């Protein structure tokens, strides 16, 4: 299936989880393509892609080149498609390039129909771009990433989530009374919340510094085993 | 002066710091106006504004009303101007309204020129909309909010900060080796780094659930004293 | 009866810490000066600090955070006065750097120090000439003591109700 991951807010762990989940799925014996749809182009750095490597699907479309040549093989069952490095001007003026990324919609539908991959994961931005909406419509399932804090609690009441999305908790901490209170309330009020969560783990802070998914960096870390549980849950519930 | 606070990344603490800094400056005997430029309209909830209160400067403009009637007085020396609540329709279609709000750019200079406020704090998002760049142009000084993690370390090398901005560290944790490594590297390489930082603090997580600035919620909390140091540092360095 | 902070300044001045009202500050330092069981000129250092033009003493006082018991401070006449108990004069900048979070040169434009007993006592004489109307109070005390017209109690704590007002 095509699984979208989108944080209800910035900095909740969407990219790290996307890389960790792609590593767990390929380790379970599944063919996986992971696609960075966030213009910040950070997903690639969890797969040892050099920072000076500016290639990507959107960078290729803006330059007139073929985005299909921007793929990267990480393992025999995990392929990566980075966004590409935008210049400072492009970053400051999204309206210059946001409308020029139409090909990726049909391109992903082609990769769906080809049957090469059992899983296509997409690291999705929280912006309201038309291209972001189009990629969300191409997704079979979606995960909304949250932290257990008052900010995300407010957002779950005032902003829309993808249709049929499930809520995934990240950065769950030890010894926070307010977190326990928000979490107990969510257990009785939030109906789309997933049964497993991801604790705050030093391995998840270090794996990006090591430029690896957390499952490869430290397979026995608690967060790696939680992500692995999430991957098996995806096999059981998001199968397609 | 007019001080803009913008996160290098979403969810680094920009809104909580903006409210806490406004409370610290007001407590120091300064007349403060704090305005929410983020369309998520979360700043108001740190000042005990009812969630159902939809009024705001951008809401009044989209309704043809007077944005000057949207202000709210918190204390005798602290006023706030919320953004206002947008509908889900306006949320998912920001092309319509993100160009109909340039009136606030000219109106802020009226408040800037009246001399009624010694400080005008602006909670700025990190989108690249034209209204965000205009409000940032009105600012005399800027604070770029970061956390000490690999995500922000990358952003400091691949994206642009406001001109003349100073980098403020938030959520500094105890007992994180990768954080300690990134921090020491920053101390030796990041020129624009402020001489004080804000630790991770349960008071900072609880004050939003109590709908108060951290200085009002828990004045003896470590993060409250650190932000009070930042307030005095602003008096010494950002008065012009 | 006798105030607790005044009682300590009378009998156990070395147990005080933090802000002391001007007259209590002067009395505590004077009682240390006349204690016969303390060394002759090793009681500590008295420091008068003048803030830079861009800050008031009430604001600079919020940065004065001593930790050593016996370190006390007061404000009056646009001066912040410290007494650092048993601090050697050559270690003044060390003690000062532990008390303020920013460099003291960036907070204060001028400084005067007294470490000899006769010089400290002579300065106490001059400080006591200051009229009580010129004595400062900490900002949290005076600010929180102003009338709150938008207050409301939730059964445990006070809260402020934000009030609509036109920006003009």
């Amino acid at each position: 299936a095509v699984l979208g991951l989108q944080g209800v807010r910035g900095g909740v762990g969407t990219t790290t989880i996307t890389a960790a989940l792609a590593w767990s799925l390929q380790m379970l014996g599944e063919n996986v393509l992971v696609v960075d749809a966030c213009p910040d182009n950070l997903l690639r750095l969890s797969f040892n892609v050099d920072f000076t490597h500016r290639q990507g699907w959107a960078r290729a479309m803006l330059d007139g080149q073929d985005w299909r040549d921007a793929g990267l093989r990480y393992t025999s069952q995990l392929d990566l498609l980075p966004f590409g490095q935008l210049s400072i001007e492009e970053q400051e003026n999204p309206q210059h390039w946001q409308t020029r990324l139409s090909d990726i919609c049909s391109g992903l539908q082609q990769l769906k129909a080809s049957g090469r991959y059992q899983w296509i994961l997409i690291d999705l931005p929280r912006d309201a771009s038309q291209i972001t909406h189009q990629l969300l419509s191409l997704c079979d399932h979606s995960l909304a990433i949250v932290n257990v804090d008052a900010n995300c609690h407010i957002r779950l009441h005032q902003q829309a989530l993808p249709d049929g999305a499930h809520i995934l908790i990240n950065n769950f901490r030890i010894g926070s009374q307010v977190q326990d209170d928000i979490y107990q309330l969510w257990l009785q009020s939030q109906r789309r919340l997933l049964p497993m969560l991801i604790h705050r783990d030093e391995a998840m802070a270090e794996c990006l510094a090591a430029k690896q998914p957390v499952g490869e960096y430290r397979s026995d870390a608690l967060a790696a085993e939680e992500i692995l549980t999430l991957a098996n849950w995806c096999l059981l519930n998001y199968s397609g | 002066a007019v001080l803009g606070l913008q996160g290098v990344r979403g969810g680094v603490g920009t809104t909580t710091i903006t409210a806490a800094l406004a409370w610290s400056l007001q407590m120091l005997g300064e007349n403060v106006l704090v305005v929410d430029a983020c369309p998520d309209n979360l700043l108001r909830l740190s000042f005990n504004v009812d969630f159902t209160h939809r009024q705001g400067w951008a809401r009044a403009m989209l309704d043809g009303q007077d944005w000057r009637d949207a202000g709210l007085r918190y204390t005798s020396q602290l006023d706030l101007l919320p953004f206002g609540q947008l509908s889900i329709e306006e949320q998912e279609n920001p092309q319509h309204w993100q160009t109909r709000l340039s009136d606030i750019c000219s109106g802020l200079q009226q408040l800037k020129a009246s001399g009624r406020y010694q400080w005008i704090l602006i909670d700025l998002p990190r989108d690249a909309s034209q209204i965000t760049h205009q409000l940032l142009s009105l600012c005399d000084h800027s604070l770029a909010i970061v956390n000490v993690d690999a995500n922000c370390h990358i952003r400091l090398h691949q994206q642009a900060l406001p001109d003349g901005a100073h980098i403020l560290i938030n959520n500094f944790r105890i007992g994180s080796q990768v954080q300690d490594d990134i921090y020491q590297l920053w101390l030796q390489s990041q020129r624009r780094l402020l001489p004080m930082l804000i630790h991770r603090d349960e008071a900072m997580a609880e004050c939003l659930a109590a709908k108060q600035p951290v200085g009002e919620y828990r004045s003896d909390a470590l993060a409250a004293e650190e932000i009070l140091t930042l307030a005095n540092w602003c008096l010494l360095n950002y008065s012009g | 009866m006798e105030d607790i902070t005044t009682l300590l300044s009378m009998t156990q001045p070395l147990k005080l810490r933090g802000f002391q009202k001007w007259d209590v500050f002067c009395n505590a330092v004077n009682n240390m000066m006349n204690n016969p069981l303390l060394p002759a000129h090793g009681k500590g250092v008295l420091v008068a600090l003048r803030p830079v033009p861009g800050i008031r003493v009430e604001q600079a006082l919020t940065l004065c955070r001593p930790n050593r018991t016996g370190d006390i401070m007061t404000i009056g006449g646009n001066r912040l006065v410290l007494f650092l108990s048993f601090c050697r004069i050559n270690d003044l900048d060390t003690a000062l750097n532990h008390i303020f979070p920013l460099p003291t040169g960036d907070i204060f434009s001028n400084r005067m120090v007294w470490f000899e007993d006769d010089q400290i006592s002579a300065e106490l004489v001059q400080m006591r000439l200051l009229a009580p109307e010129q004595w400062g109070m900490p900002l949290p005390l005076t600010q929180s003591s102003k009338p709150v017209i938008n207050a409301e109690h939730d059964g445990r704590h006070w809260r402020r109700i934000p009030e609509p007002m036109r920006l003009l």
């Binding site: 008052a150 609690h153 009785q188 939030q190 | 969630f51 | -």
Partner: peptide
């Protein structure tokens, strides 16, 4: 997102949390 505050009052810990944090109580009604 489907949020259901049907019987939040009945759970003991949730009652004390709704009474301490005005933000949670605000959305529960």
């Amino acid at each position: 997102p489907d949020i259901d505050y049907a019987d939040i009052s009945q759970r003991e810990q949730l009652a004390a949390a709704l009474k301490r944090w005005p933000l949670l109580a605000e959305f529960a009604q």
